[PDB]
Amino acid sequence: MEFMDALIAQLQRQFRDYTISLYQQGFLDDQFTELKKLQDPDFVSEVLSLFFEDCVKLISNMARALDTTGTVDFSQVGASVHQLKGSSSSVGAKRVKTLCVSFKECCEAKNYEGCVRCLQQVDIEYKALKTKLQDMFNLEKQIIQAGGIVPQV
C-alpha cells in the first residue's frame, strides 16, 4: 500500500548505493554479479555461506600447516591457497582472490614470512567481506518484507 512507498524507495536507494560502493572498493566483481543472475529466492546467500565455510576450513589448514612442529609443507599450504583462490573466484570475492594470487607466489618461493603475512591479510579480508555481505543481505530482507522489489543494479 502506497504509504510504504516513501520507505521502499529509500532502501532501494541505500541498496544501490552500498552495492555500487562495494564494487568501487573492489570487494566484489563480475562473478558476484554473474551469480546474482542465478536468482529466480535467497539462494545467493546459501552459496555464500558455503564459501565462508571454505574460508574457515581452508584457512585453518594453512595456519595448522604454517605453525611449525618442524619444517613447513609448502606444497600443502599451497593447495589450500589454490582452492581458496578458485572458491573466492567463483563468488566474486575480489580482495580475497587477489591476496590468494600473491600468497601462491610465497609458497612456490618458500618465503615463510610472506606466507604468514599473506594469511593475516586473507583472514582480515574474508572477515570484512562477510560483514559487508551480511549488511547487504539484511538490506535485501528489510526491502522484501516492507513490500518492495530488489533492483538489478
Side-chain angles (χ1 to χ4, degrees):
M1 271 302 97
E2 289 139 45
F3 64 114
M4 300 286 263
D5 289 21
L7 186 76
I8 299 182
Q10 97 78 41
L11 307 148
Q12 285 169 349
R13 199 182 178 171
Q14 206 175 2
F15 195 74
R16 269 178 273 94
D17 283 35
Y18 193 59
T19 277
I20 289 147
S21 101
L22 303 169
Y23 283 72
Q24 200 150 333
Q25 287 160 97
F27 282 93
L28 299 180
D29 66 33
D30 191 51
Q31 295 320 113
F32 186 82
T33 312
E34 216 73 32
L35 150 74
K36 285 308 222 144
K37 290 183 173 191
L38 321 155
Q39 218 96 68
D40 45 24
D42 63 2
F43 142 121
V44 159
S45 79
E46 287 130 309
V47 163
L48 261 132
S49 80
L50 292 178
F51 171 71
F52 302 113
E53 294 189 347
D54 271 2
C55 294
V56 158
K57 180 215 195 177
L58 291 178
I59 296 153
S60 82
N61 291 5
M62 302 171 219
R64 166 154 80 264
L66 280 179
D67 197 334
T68 166
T69 133
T71 297
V72 185
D73 196 330
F74 287 90
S75 184
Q76 78 172 195
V77 171
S80 291
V81 173
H82 188 78
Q83 295 275 112
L84 192 43
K85 215 212 72 159
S87 209
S88 53
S89 184
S90 94
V91 299
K94 207 180 73 172
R95 293 192 184 181
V96 170
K97 165 137 101 83
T98 295
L99 289 172
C100 280
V101 180
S102 292
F103 200 167
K104 202 74 146 287
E105 214 55 53
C106 297
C107 281
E108 262 170 31
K110 309 185 193 206
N111 172 0
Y112 177 95
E113 166 180 0
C115 286
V116 169
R117 187 65 48 100
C118 269
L119 188 77
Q120 318 171 312
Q121 301 323 130
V122 154
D123 197 71
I124 278 131
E125 292 294 333
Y126 100 84
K127 285 183 196 207
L129 184 61
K130 189 195 219 305
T131 277
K132 313 284 189 178
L133 298 195
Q134 319 260 214
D135 283 350
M136 216 203 53
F137 298 133
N138 281 348
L139 223 145
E140 296 194 24
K141 291 147 170 169
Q142 305 166 49
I143 299 183
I144 301 279
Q145 82 78 43
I149 55 97
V150 307
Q152 296 185 292
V153 319

PDB file of all heavy atoms in Angstrom, residues 7 11 14 135 137-147:
ATOM      1  N   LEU A   7       9.303   4.635   2.203  1.00  0.00           N
ATOM      2  CA  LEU A   7      10.337   3.764   2.738  1.00  0.00           C
ATOM      3  C   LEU A   7      10.939   2.819   1.650  1.00  0.00           C
ATOM      4  O   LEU A   7      12.157   2.858   1.395  1.00  0.00           O
ATOM      5  CB  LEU A   7       9.761   3.006   3.943  1.00  0.00           C
ATOM      6  CG  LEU A   7      10.625   2.108   4.820  1.00  0.00           C
ATOM      7  CD1 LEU A   7      11.495   2.933   5.736  1.00  0.00           C
ATOM      8  CD2 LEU A   7       9.720   1.216   5.641  1.00  0.00           C
ATOM      9  N   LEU A  11      15.298   2.622   0.807  1.00  0.00           N
ATOM     10  CA  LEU A  11      16.139   1.439   0.990  1.00  0.00           C
ATOM     11  C   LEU A  11      16.629   0.978  -0.361  1.00  0.00           C
ATOM     12  O   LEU A  11      17.798   0.619  -0.526  1.00  0.00           O
ATOM     13  CB  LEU A  11      15.380   0.305   1.648  1.00  0.00           C
ATOM     14  CG  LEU A  11      14.697   0.676   2.958  1.00  0.00           C
ATOM     15  CD1 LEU A  11      13.433  -0.152   3.066  1.00  0.00           C
ATOM     16  CD2 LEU A  11      15.574   0.581   4.215  1.00  0.00           C
ATOM     17  N   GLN A  14      19.504   3.285  -0.719  1.00  0.00           N
ATOM     18  CA  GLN A  14      20.528   2.729   0.181  1.00  0.00           C
ATOM     19  C   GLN A  14      21.256   1.512  -0.403  1.00  0.00           C
ATOM     20  O   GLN A  14      22.488   1.530  -0.520  1.00  0.00           O
ATOM     21  CB  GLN A  14      19.888   2.351   1.524  1.00  0.00           C
ATOM     22  CG  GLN A  14      20.837   2.359   2.723  1.00  0.00           C
ATOM     23  CD  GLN A  14      20.088   2.093   4.018  1.00  0.00           C
ATOM     24  OE1 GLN A  14      18.879   1.862   4.017  1.00  0.00           O
ATOM     25  NE2 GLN A  14      20.790   2.145   5.126  1.00  0.00           N
ATOM     26  N   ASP A 135      25.281  -7.243   5.815  1.00  0.00           N
ATOM     27  CA  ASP A 135      24.584  -5.979   5.716  1.00  0.00           C
ATOM     28  C   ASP A 135      23.756  -6.036   4.484  1.00  0.00           C
ATOM     29  O   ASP A 135      22.540  -5.890   4.551  1.00  0.00           O
ATOM     30  CB  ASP A 135      25.530  -4.818   5.597  1.00  0.00           C
ATOM     31  CG  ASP A 135      26.152  -4.466   6.895  1.00  0.00           C
ATOM     32  OD1 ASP A 135      25.701  -5.004   7.940  1.00  0.00           O
ATOM     33  OD2 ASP A 135      27.105  -3.653   6.864  1.00  0.00           O
ATOM     34  N   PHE A 137      22.666  -8.411   2.564  1.00  0.00           N
ATOM     35  CA  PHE A 137      21.523  -9.309   2.655  1.00  0.00           C
ATOM     36  C   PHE A 137      20.487  -8.833   3.635  1.00  0.00           C
ATOM     37  O   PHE A 137      19.291  -8.918   3.349  1.00  0.00           O
ATOM     38  CB  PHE A 137      21.914 -10.797   2.855  1.00  0.00           C
ATOM     39  CG  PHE A 137      22.709 -11.337   1.706  1.00  0.00           C
ATOM     40  CD1 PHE A 137      23.864 -12.075   1.913  1.00  0.00           C
ATOM     41  CD2 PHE A 137      22.335 -11.034   0.382  1.00  0.00           C
ATOM     42  CE1 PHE A 137      24.612 -12.502   0.827  1.00  0.00           C
ATOM     43  CE2 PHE A 137      23.086 -11.472  -0.709  1.00  0.00           C
ATOM     44  CZ  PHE A 137      24.228 -12.196  -0.477  1.00  0.00           C
ATOM     45  N   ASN A 138      20.927  -8.320   4.779  1.00  0.00           N
ATOM     46  CA  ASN A 138      19.982  -7.709   5.695  1.00  0.00           C
ATOM     47  C   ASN A 138      19.135  -6.708   4.973  1.00  0.00           C
ATOM     48  O   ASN A 138      17.896  -6.799   4.984  1.00  0.00           O
ATOM     49  CB  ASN A 138      20.692  -6.996   6.796  1.00  0.00           C
ATOM     50  CG  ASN A 138      21.179  -7.946   7.852  1.00  0.00           C
ATOM     51  OD1 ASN A 138      20.794  -9.125   7.882  1.00  0.00           O
ATOM     52  ND2 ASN A 138      22.054  -7.435   8.733  1.00  0.00           N
ATOM     53  N   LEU A 139      19.813  -5.769   4.321  1.00  0.00           N
ATOM     54  CA  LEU A 139      19.164  -4.774   3.487  1.00  0.00           C
ATOM     55  C   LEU A 139      18.195  -5.365   2.489  1.00  0.00           C
ATOM     56  O   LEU A 139      17.077  -4.869   2.343  1.00  0.00           O
ATOM     57  CB  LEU A 139      20.209  -3.979   2.769  1.00  0.00           C
ATOM     58  CG  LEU A 139      19.934  -2.496   2.750  1.00  0.00           C
ATOM     59  CD1 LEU A 139      21.244  -1.718   2.837  1.00  0.00           C
ATOM     60  CD2 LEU A 139      19.211  -2.259   1.437  1.00  0.00           C
ATOM     61  N   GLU A 140      18.583  -6.434   1.800  1.00  0.00           N
ATOM     62  CA  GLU A 140      17.587  -7.163   0.980  1.00  0.00           C
ATOM     63  C   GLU A 140      16.290  -7.578   1.758  1.00  0.00           C
ATOM     64  O   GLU A 140      15.180  -7.246   1.319  1.00  0.00           O
ATOM     65  CB  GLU A 140      18.227  -8.325   0.238  1.00  0.00           C
ATOM     66  CG  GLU A 140      19.262  -7.891  -0.789  1.00  0.00           C
ATOM     67  CD  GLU A 140      19.657  -9.003  -1.759  1.00  0.00           C
ATOM     68  OE1 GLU A 140      18.851  -9.951  -1.952  1.00  0.00           O
ATOM     69  OE2 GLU A 140      20.778  -8.928  -2.336  1.00  0.00           O
ATOM     70  N   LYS A 141      16.431  -8.262   2.904  1.00  0.00           N
ATOM     71  CA  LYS A 141      15.312  -8.608   3.827  1.00  0.00           C
ATOM     72  C   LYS A 141      14.388  -7.408   4.274  1.00  0.00           C
ATOM     73  O   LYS A 141      13.134  -7.481   4.247  1.00  0.00           O
ATOM     74  CB  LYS A 141      15.900  -9.357   5.057  1.00  0.00           C
ATOM     75  CG  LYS A 141      16.421 -10.747   4.705  1.00  0.00           C
ATOM     76  CD  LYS A 141      17.629 -11.161   5.542  1.00  0.00           C
ATOM     77  CE  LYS A 141      17.960 -12.638   5.322  1.00  0.00           C
ATOM     78  NZ  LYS A 141      19.276 -13.053   5.896  1.00  0.00           N
ATOM     79  N   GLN A 142      15.028  -6.314   4.687  1.00  0.00           N
ATOM     80  CA  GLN A 142      14.357  -5.065   5.011  1.00  0.00           C
ATOM     81  C   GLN A 142      13.516  -4.513   3.848  1.00  0.00           C
ATOM     82  O   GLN A 142      12.494  -3.875   4.079  1.00  0.00           O
ATOM     83  CB  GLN A 142      15.380  -4.004   5.464  1.00  0.00           C
ATOM     84  CG  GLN A 142      16.264  -4.453   6.620  1.00  0.00           C
ATOM     85  CD  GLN A 142      17.455  -3.540   6.826  1.00  0.00           C
ATOM     86  OE1 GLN A 142      17.311  -2.329   6.883  1.00  0.00           O
ATOM     87  NE2 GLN A 142      18.637  -4.118   6.951  1.00  0.00           N
ATOM     88  N   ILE A 143      13.955  -4.714   2.612  1.00  0.00           N
ATOM     89  CA  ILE A 143      13.162  -4.310   1.457  1.00  0.00           C
ATOM     90  C   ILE A 143      12.016  -5.276   1.155  1.00  0.00           C
ATOM     91  O   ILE A 143      10.881  -4.839   0.976  1.00  0.00           O
ATOM     92  CB  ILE A 143      14.019  -4.189   0.191  1.00  0.00           C
ATOM     93  CG1 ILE A 143      15.093  -3.132   0.384  1.00  0.00           C
ATOM     94  CG2 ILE A 143      13.136  -3.889  -1.003  1.00  0.00           C
ATOM     95  CD1 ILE A 143      15.952  -2.900  -0.842  1.00  0.00           C
ATOM     96  N   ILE A 144      12.332  -6.572   1.073  1.00  0.00           N
ATOM     97  CA  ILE A 144      11.381  -7.624   0.689  1.00  0.00           C
ATOM     98  C   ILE A 144      10.133  -7.553   1.567  1.00  0.00           C
ATOM     99  O   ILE A 144       9.053  -7.227   1.085  1.00  0.00           O
ATOM    100  CB  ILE A 144      11.996  -9.071   0.754  1.00  0.00           C
ATOM    101  CG1 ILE A 144      13.229  -9.247  -0.157  1.00  0.00           C
ATOM    102  CG2 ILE A 144      10.954 -10.116   0.408  1.00  0.00           C
ATOM    103  CD1 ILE A 144      12.958  -9.503  -1.636  1.00  0.00           C
ATOM    104  N   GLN A 145      10.256  -7.892   2.845  1.00  0.00           N
ATOM    105  CA  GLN A 145       9.158  -7.590   3.771  1.00  0.00           C
ATOM    106  C   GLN A 145       9.335  -6.101   3.900  1.00  0.00           C
ATOM    107  O   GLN A 145      10.466  -5.634   3.971  1.00  0.00           O
ATOM    108  CB  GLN A 145       9.253  -8.366   5.109  1.00  0.00           C
ATOM    109  CG  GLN A 145      10.177  -7.808   6.186  1.00  0.00           C
ATOM    110  CD  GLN A 145       9.555  -6.637   6.918  1.00  0.00           C
ATOM    111  OE1 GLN A 145       8.365  -6.669   7.262  1.00  0.00           O
ATOM    112  NE2 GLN A 145      10.349  -5.578   7.141  1.00  0.00           N
ATOM    113  N   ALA A 146       8.229  -5.378   3.871  1.00  0.00           N
ATOM    114  CA  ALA A 146       8.173  -3.926   3.543  1.00  0.00           C
ATOM    115  C   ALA A 146       7.781  -3.703   2.093  1.00  0.00           C
ATOM    116  O   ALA A 146       7.710  -2.562   1.653  1.00  0.00           O
ATOM    117  CB  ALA A 146       9.450  -3.169   3.843  1.00  0.00           C
ATOM    118  N   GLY A 147       7.592  -4.811   1.368  1.00  0.00           N
ATOM    119  CA  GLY A 147       6.879  -4.880   0.094  1.00  0.00           C
ATOM    120  C   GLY A 147       7.478  -4.384  -1.212  1.00  0.00           C
ATOM    121  O   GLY A 147       6.750  -4.261  -2.195  1.00  0.00           O
TER     122      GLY A 147
END
